[PDB]
RNA sequence: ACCAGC
């Protein structure tokens with residue numbers, strides 16, 4: 001087992017130069033350094049470590065280091081170099097699953113961290129936590145160039161090579177080894193009967209928990225689909241931007257003549273301030289003097305202003321009744337502009353040269369093992385039920401990537417699971433009601449007959465209502481879904497509670513398992529804990545933040561892992577079938593939101609093979625962990641991501 | 646503008662160059678130093694006469710501006726005072742190139758620099774004709790730009806014939822090739838460069854394909 | 863750039879205040895933010911006010927971000943625009959009124975932009 | 977505090 005690091009010229013997008021590399025060994029204990037002219041010897045040492053049957057340790061290796069090696073081995077000295085995934089291990093993957101809760105333990109330590117590293121899984125943060133850090137590189141470099149005449153306001157301190165970069169690389173691999181000796185010192189994930197510094201690639205994975213393999217495979221898959229990208233249309237979204245930019249310039253000239261300007265107190269200094277529809281304070285003052293009583297006070301001195309109070313509002317002047325709809329439309333168009341093009345993290349400022357968008361996908365960002373998305377966020381664009389929703393999802397299509405050998409568009413297949421957490425709930429409480437609850441779920445659609453038996457107008461309101469009622473609501477927040485008072489909210493809870501009397505029994509069992517005593521305060525709550533963590537489906541310690549949300553962190557944390565194994569198995573079957581992954585192959589992963597997957601492929605027969613093998617992969621997921629239920633998905637075929645939602 | 650800035654009154658200090666790759670020994674040998682006046686650290690270059698008398702300063706700031714201390718002479722060369730003889734000189738375009746060549750040769754060859762640049766190089770090479778007579782070979786080292794080609798073409802007219810040889814570089818000039826690690830390819834250009842051929846005259850044998858091309862038109 | 867959330871002190875909320883890399887905080891609930899002539903005219907001396915133009919239509923924030931401010935000196939109304947440099951300092955000014963009295967104060971360069 | 981998602 002070796003521990004190595006890299007230094008490059010820039011990020012993974014455009015990397016063209018190797019600088020230095022330090023390899024430390026657990027068999028000879030040598031700081032084997034390398035040079036810019038010694039990159040071939042570095043690759044020979046890595047291939048000798050691969051061929052002997054060992055493991056190579058990196059930090060953020062799946063996302064950054066391994067494709068940088070693969071690119072620099074080809075574009076500098078023209079030789080193929082591929083690392084197997086069963087030999088490369090990462091320390092940033094292990095930092096997220098053992099220590100999955102840093103924001104709830106960073107206080108009391110902030111005396112150590114400067115403040116900018118608050119809850120950071122970066123290696124400099126752990127160097128500050130392990131108290132092994134002989135200064136920084138960026139700040140010392142900036143201080144050196146401010147000591148010299150030439151200043152460097154850019155902040156990309158990886159152009160030239162020197163010896164200080166070698167010294168901080170040695171410091172970086174020392175910090176990496178210091179993180180690895182602590183992260184391997186856990187007893188719940190690694191059994192304390194064998195040393196993990198001398199085992200092969202068939203022993204380190206097969207003599208530990210299942211959670212350490214699935215997370216590294218998911219990190220490999222998510223780094224690969226991050227490297228793949230997502231096709232995007234530039235002209236169709238500029239047409240939308242030039243469409244809805246001349247709309248808010250009409251909604252301000254027409255509106256300020258209705259709601260006039262006024263003087264505001266700054267001998268008494270006054271100012272001539274005009275109506276700003278973006279502020280929620282001016283609209284409140286203009287609805288006070290228009291003859292309206294809010295009858296709703298969330299704040300201690302101010303009413304609430306949102307979409308549900310601007311619908312049931314009546315004034316005497318009939319012009320303001322039509323103007324409030326224009327105010328709501330202006331706020332919607334303002335949010336559309338802020339999300340689409342004019343935002344700091346907008347769509348048009350993260351488009352690559354090949355017309356694609358590469359988004360950061362964090363595999364373990366939530367406290368319940370749910371993956372998050374950032375820079376940009378591709379899982380929060382408006383749906384088809386929202387206004388200007390179909391015109392946005394038509395641009396995020398897979399038919400905008402012509403093939404490089406034929407010049408033809410491709411076909412997008414989107415596969416969603418229906419009733420995931422509600423079927424997992426039937427899996428958990430099957431030992432209480434003897435398992436006659438998951439049979440009605442398999443008998444037709446559950447949300448349709450729930451809508452019929454609950455007289456909700458839409459299926460979406462019923463799907464919102466059932467997960468509102470299930471995850472610990474109140475008396476008014478689920479009466480707010482139907483718009484009635486607390487009496488209907490009480491009678492619907494008494495209706496849906498007496499149907500299946502196994503939810504309260506499972507809740508009482510979980511409360512008897514976790515908590516033992518709970519002292520009550522009139523303004524707080526003092527809870528003496530007994531077991532803070534919950535064993536998951538793979539022995540992972542799932543953290544609990546609040547005791548009345550234990551059903552939440554027991555349900556959705558067990559629902560993400562089956563999807564995380566299913567997205568692995570649905571390509572492990574296709575690779576063994578004899579297909580090819582990548583843009584020059586047969587299929588390519590594009591987007592993985594919490595429920596559905598979006599794959600893009602060349603011909604429709606490949607989409608048929610994918611939609612056939614997805615059910616078999618989901619069946620293997622349901623069979624591998626011995627589930628009492630029967631899992632099922634549903635797929636759609638189309639040109640873009642407006643039909644396949 | 647005022648006077649020659651002394652290092653004592655301006656808090657002079659000899660340091661290295663991290664962003665360009667020059668240690669403090671070369672700037673100690675030459676006299677390119679750093680003043681701390683008005684808060685902002687100013688870079689400043691020193692000019693000397695043949696005997697060693699300080700005659701001119703070149704003041705540059707953090708934001709690429711120029712400041713002359715007074716009467717800038719036409720025979721002002723950066724590095725002329727240190728060497729008074731030799732068989733092979735290298736004339737650099739700027740001032741960091743001469744320090745870069747001093748770094749890669751351990752202070753062996755007589756290497757100087759210009760005082761005007763590529764704009765008024767012909768006047769300062771015509772006014773320094775008597776200094777180049779005591780030498781045996783001259784290696785012109787200019788930028789790989791259109792202005793650099795114009796300077797190496799037109800400034801090589803007032804020079805003595807038979808002693809001018811021009812080297813080529815893959816970078817902009819020698820300093821980025823020092824930064825990109827091309828320290829072996831520059832020494833061959835110092836030792837074996839190309840003579841003063843491409844002025845505009847052609848050979849009788851080099852046209853053999855091109856006359857064919859006009860024969861195929 | 864945004865980093866994370868801190869509990870506010872004015873509104874007293876838990877996730878209302880946000881911390882930035884520049885050192886300033888901003889709360890979303892309480893809305894509190896923390897941290898010729900040859901003479902360039904001073905802003906506070908000539909009664910500088912960021913008034914929004916009414917007859918043609920320009921918001922106040924554009925006049926704040928551009929530096930086009932109204933002076934009320936000598937009982938009249940002037941519209942002073944400011945020309946700056948790359949360093950972030952006022953280089954020159956332009957004065958415009960109803961009679962279009964072009965009184966360009968300061969060192970007006972030949973390559974001045976806005 | 978608001979908006980969107982699953």
Ligand SMILES: Cc1cn([C@H]2C[C@H](O)[C@@H](COP(=O)(O)OP(=O)(O)OP(=O)(O)O)O2)c(=O)[nH]c1=O
Pocket residue numbers: 416417418419420421422463464467559594595982
């Ligand atoms: C809308 C919503 C869904 N969820 C859960 C329910 C699901 O397990 C997952 C995604 O929900 P959905 O995909 O919207 O619902 P579904 O998969 O049960 O049905 P279908 O595919 O036929 O439309 O997230 C919440 O926890 N809170 C929510 O507000």
Ligand SMILES: [Mg+2]
Pocket residue numbers: 005006059060
């Ligand atoms: Mg690294």
Ligand SMILES: [Mg+2]
Pocket residue numbers: 416417418419595596
């Ligand atoms: Mg679904």
Ligand SMILES: [Zn+2]
Pocket residue numbers: 870871872873874875878879889890891892893894
């Ligand atoms: Zn606040």
